[PDB]
Amino acid sequence: SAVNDPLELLTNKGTHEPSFLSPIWNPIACGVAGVGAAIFINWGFRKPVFSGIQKHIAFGAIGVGAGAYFDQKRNEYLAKRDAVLRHYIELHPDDFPVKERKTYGQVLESWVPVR
Amino acid sequence: PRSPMASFAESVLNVIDGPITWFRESIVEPNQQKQNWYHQRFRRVPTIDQCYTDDAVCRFEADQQFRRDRMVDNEIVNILRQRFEDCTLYEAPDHMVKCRPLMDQYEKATENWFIKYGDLGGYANAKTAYMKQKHRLIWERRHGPVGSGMK
Amino acid sequence: MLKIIFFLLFLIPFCFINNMYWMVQIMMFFISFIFLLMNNFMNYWSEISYFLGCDMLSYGLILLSLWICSLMLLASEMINKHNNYKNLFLLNIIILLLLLILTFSSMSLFMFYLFFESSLIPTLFLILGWGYQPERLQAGLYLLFYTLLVSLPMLIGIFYLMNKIGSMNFYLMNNFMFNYDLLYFCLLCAFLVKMPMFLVHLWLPKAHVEAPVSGSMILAGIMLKLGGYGMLRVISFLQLMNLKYSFVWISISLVGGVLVSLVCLRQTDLKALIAYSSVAHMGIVLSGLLTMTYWGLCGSYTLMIAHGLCSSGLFCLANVSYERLGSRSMLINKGLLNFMPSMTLWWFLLSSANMAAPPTLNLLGEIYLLNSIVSWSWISMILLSFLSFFSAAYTLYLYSFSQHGKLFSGVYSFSSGKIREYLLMLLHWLPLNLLILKSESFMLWL
Amino acid sequence: TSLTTEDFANPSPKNWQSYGFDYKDQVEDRKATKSTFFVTVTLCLVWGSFYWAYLPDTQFRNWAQREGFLELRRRELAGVDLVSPNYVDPASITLPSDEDLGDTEIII
Amino acid sequence: VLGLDKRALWGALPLLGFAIGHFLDKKETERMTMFRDKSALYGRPAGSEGKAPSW
Amino acid sequence: GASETGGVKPMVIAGRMVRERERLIGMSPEERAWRKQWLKDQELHHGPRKVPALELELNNPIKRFYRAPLDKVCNVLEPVLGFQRAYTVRFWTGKALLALTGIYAGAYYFKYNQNDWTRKGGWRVIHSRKQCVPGDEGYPKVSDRSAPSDYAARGFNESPL
DSSP, X not given: OOEEOHHHHHSOOSOOOOOTTHHHHHXXXXXXXXXXXXXXXXXXXXXXXXXXXXXXXHHHHHHHHHHHHHHHHHHHHHHXXXXXXXXXXXXXXXXXXXXXXXXXXXXXXXXXXXX | OXXXXXXXXXXXXXXXXXXXXXXXXXXXXXXXXXXXXXOOOOOOOOOGGGSBSSOSHHHHHHHHHHHHHHHHHHHHHHHHHHHHHHHHHHSOSSOHHHHHHHHHHHHHHHHHHHHHTTTOOTTOOHHHHHHHHHHHHHHHHHHOSTTSOOO | OHHHHHHHHHTGGGGTSSSOHHHHHHHHHHHHHHHHHOOOXXXXXXXXXXXXXXXXXXXXXXXXXXXXXXXXXXXXXHHHHTTSXXXXXXXXXXXXXXXXXXXXXXXXXXXXXXXXXXXXXXXXXXXXXXXXXXXXXXXXXXXHHHXXXXXXXXXXXXXXXXXXXXXXXXXXXXXXXXXXXXXXXXXXXXXXXXXXXXXXXXXXXXHHHHSOHHHHHHIIIIIHHXXXXXXXXXXXXXXHHHHHHHHHHHHHHHHXXXXXXXXXXXXXXXXXXXXXXXXXXXXXXXXXXXXXXXXXXXXXXXXXXXXXXXXXXXXXXHHHHHHHHOOOBTTTSOOGGGTOHHHHHHHXXXXXXXXXXXXXXXXXXXXXXXXXXXXXXXXXXXXXXXXXXXXXXXXXXXXXXXXXXXXXXSOOOOOXXXXXXXHHHHHHHHHHHXXXXXXXXXXXXX | OOOOTTTTTSOOTTSOOOOSSOSSOHHXXXXXXXXXXXXXXXXXXXXXXHHHHTOOOOSSSHHHHHHHHHHHHHHHHTTSOSSXXXXXXXXXXXXXXXXXXXXOOOOO | OOOOOGGGGGGHHHHHHHHHHXXXXXXXXXXXXXXXXXXXXXXXXXXXXXXXXXX | OOOTTTTSOOOOOSOGGGSHHHHHSOOOHHHHHHHXXXXXXXXXXXXXXXXXXXXXHTSOHHHHHHSHHHHHHHHHHHHHHOHHHHXXXXXXXXXXXXXXXXXXXXXXXXXXXXXXXXXXXXXXXXXXXXXXXXXXXXXXXXXXXXXXXXXXXXXXXXXXX
C-alpha cells in the first residue's frame, strides 16, 4: 500500500516461510560441535580418535539437547522483542507518524556525470 | 567466361561446390528433423518514475528493463554503422555520394544514444538515466538547448 | 551454489587419510569442471542460498581461484616428496579455498569483509610453515600488518553504512550516494593497499620473494584481486566522492607504474622482478577502475583474471629454476635454454603474455583500461606510453637474461624438467588464450 | 658398477624414471599421472570448452541482435527517431517549476 | 586409462557432499514461491493460467 | 626407488680443457693425454641404433591406429621404391589428404553456416561489387541496393518474422 505505517511494518502475517536449515541448524551445529570436541580429547591424549565412542555420543547428545533448549528460548526473546517495539509504537503515535511514500516523479536529486 | 583464367576459375568453383551441395542434399538435410524455435517477448514494465523511493522490487524491475533496452539501443547503432560500413564497400570508388545519407542516419542515432545513455559510465541504472533527463530538461527551458551556454 | 561449498567441506577429511595427496587435486579439479557447467549468470545476483549468490563478476573470480588453487597442489609436489607436514599443508589450502569461495560468493558487504581478511590467516600459516629463507618472519608480519592496519578501519566504515542504508546487500547500497570525505578513505584506502598502490606496496616484494611457490601463486593470484574485486563493488555508491580525489590515485598509480618498471630493470632476483611486475600492471588496473567508465570497469575485471593466471604462471617457472640451481638470483640463472630447452618455450609464452602480447586475454583487458584512461584525460598518454614501453623492457630482460646467455660455471648436476612441470605450465597459459574465444562471459559483468 | 656395452643396450626394466608425481612407488607415479591428465585435459579443457561453445544464450546478446533488427525495422517504418533521446517521454514528465528549485544546483 | 584405484572409492564422500549441497539449494528454490509467475516481466496473464507453474 | 639417472652415476669428465682459454695458458702432460682421449671418444663409428621400446613409448594407442591404415601402403610400397621414397609417398598422400578435406569443410562452412542476423558470432562476409565491363551482361549495370534496408541485411530481409 501507499502508506508507511510503522506498526504495519512490524506486524507479522505468516507469509514468510523459515528456511529448511533454520529449525535444525542449531541442533545439528551443536551436535557436530560436541562430537568434534570429543575428537580433540582423544587426539590430545594420543588416543585413537574414534576410541571410546561413549564420550562422542554424550558430547553429541549433550550438544543437541543444549542447542534445542537455547534455540527454544531464542525465539521467545525475539518474539518478546518485537512485542516491545509494537507496544512502544502504539503508545507514541506522534513520534512515529504515518508518512507518505514519495516516488521518483516528485523528487529531484543529483546525479554523478562521470565524463 | 571470356577470359582464359576465368574459364579455369569456374572449373574449380564447380569442383568445390559440387560435393558440398551433394553432401548437404544427400546426408545432412534429408536426415534432419523438423523443429521450431521462437523469439523472447518482454512485456513492458513500469518505468522508474512510478517506483516508490522505498520499494526495491519495482526498482529492480525497471533497472533490468533499462538494461535490456540499452542493449537494443546499443546495437541499433551498431546496425546503422554496418549499413554505412557496407555501402562504403559496395559503392566505391563513388561511395561518398551514397554513404553520405547513411552516415547522416548514423550520426543522429549516436547523439540520441549519447543524450540518453551517455556520460553515465558503468553502474548506469534506471534511476541515474531518468535523473539526467530531469536535469537536462530543466536546463533546456532555462538556458535553451545545450551548446548555446548559459544566460 | 551450496553444491560447491559442501563439496569442499566433505573433502576436508581427505587431508587426514594418508596417501591421499594426489586424490585431492582430482577432487579439486573435478569440482572446477562441475562449477564450469553452471554458468548461467547475469549482472544481477543469481542462485540464492541463504546468503550466497553469484553474478558474472563473482563467477569468473571464483572460477579463477578454483583453477589456481588446484594448480597450487601440482606446483607444490615437493611437499609431498618430503612428507613435510603434507596433511596440514592440504588442510591449509582447502580451508583457504573455502574462504575465497565465500568471499566472492557473499552477497552482503559485511560478509565480503568477514571472509576478505579471514583468508589471510591461512595464507600467513602458509608462508611461515613452508618457506625456506629466514626472512619469512620479517615478510610474514608485513603481509599481516599492512592488511590488518588498513582493514580494521574499514570495519568501521562498513558499520556506519548500516545506520544509513539499513542493510549490507550490494544491490540496496547502490541506491545511495554518500558525501562524507572520510568514509571514502575508509573503503578505498583499505583496498588501495591490497592492490597494491605504488607507495604502499612495500609488503608485496617481501611477501612474494619469501613465500613458498604455492604461497606465491595465491598471493599473486587471488590476494591482489580481493582488493580489486572489493573496489568494483564499493565505487558504485562512492561515485560523487570519487570525482574529487580520483586524480590523486590515478597520478600515483600511473607514475607509480613507470617508476616501478625502472625498478624492475635494476632488480637481480627472479622472484623480486616478477613481484614488482605485479605492481606495474596492477597500477593500470586500479587506474582504469577509478576512471569508472564502462570500458575501464569491464577491462579491469578482465585484466585481473588474465594477470593472475600469468603472474601465477611466472612464479611456477622461477620455482622450477630455483629448485635446481638452488639460487633465485639472475646471475646464477643464465642460459637455461641450454640446460632445459623444452622449458624455455613456456618461459616465453608466459613472459609474452605479461607484456600484453596477443592473442592472450591479457591484451584484451589492457586495450580497454588504456581506452578509459585516455578518455579520462589526454595528458595520460605520456606515461601510459612509457609504462607500456617499459612493461616490455623488463619482461625481455627477465626472459632473455635468464634463458639466452652462456651457462653458469659453478652449477652442479641436476635433474631435467619433469612431465608434472610441463603440465603445470600448460594449464596456466593455455586457458589464458582460449578464454579470448568466450570473453563474452568473463568481460560483460556490467 | 662397471656396466657393459649391453647393459646400456638392453634396458633393465628394474629401475624407473619418475614423471614428477611420485619418487617411491612406480605404479603410483604412473597412476597419478594418468588420472591427473584425464580430469585436467579430457574434461576441463576438451569437454569444458565444447560445452562452453554450445552454452545457451544467457547474456541476451544474441537475443538483442534480433531486437536490433526487428526494433529498427518497426521504428524506421514508424517515423520515429531510430534511438529515442528520452528515457521517458518529456511531456509525461512533470518538471518542478523554477520557484520550487530555489537555487538547487543543476548539472548536465 | 583413468589410472584410478580403490583409494578413489573415498571420493564418494565428497560426491555425497555434492548431492546434499544440491538438495538444500533445490529445497531453497521451493521456498521461493511468492513472485513465482507473478512478476510484471514474466507474470502469467490474468485468467486461464497453466496448471503447473513454470520453474 | 626412482633413479632419474638410471644408476649411471652423473659426473663431469672433460675437466678444465673444455674452455679454450684454460687450454692455451697451459696443460700438464696428463691433461693433454686426457684431453686427447676425450675427443677420440666423441667419434661415433655407427649411426644411432633403433630401439623398439621408444617407438611404442612415444606413440599413444590412438595415434598407432589413427595412422595404421596409411602405414599399410607404406608397407606395401616400401619394397617397390625403397623405404625413403615410399615413406615420402606415405607422408604426402596423407598430409595432403587432410588439406583437401580441410578446404571442403571450410568451403562448406562459408556456404551454409555463415553468420546471419539470428546470431552474433560466426564469420560475416560483406563482398563488394564486381567490375562490370563491356561484353558482360547488361553493361549499364547499377547497384541494386538503393534503400538503406538493402545494406547489411545479413539475411534479415528474407526472415519470416
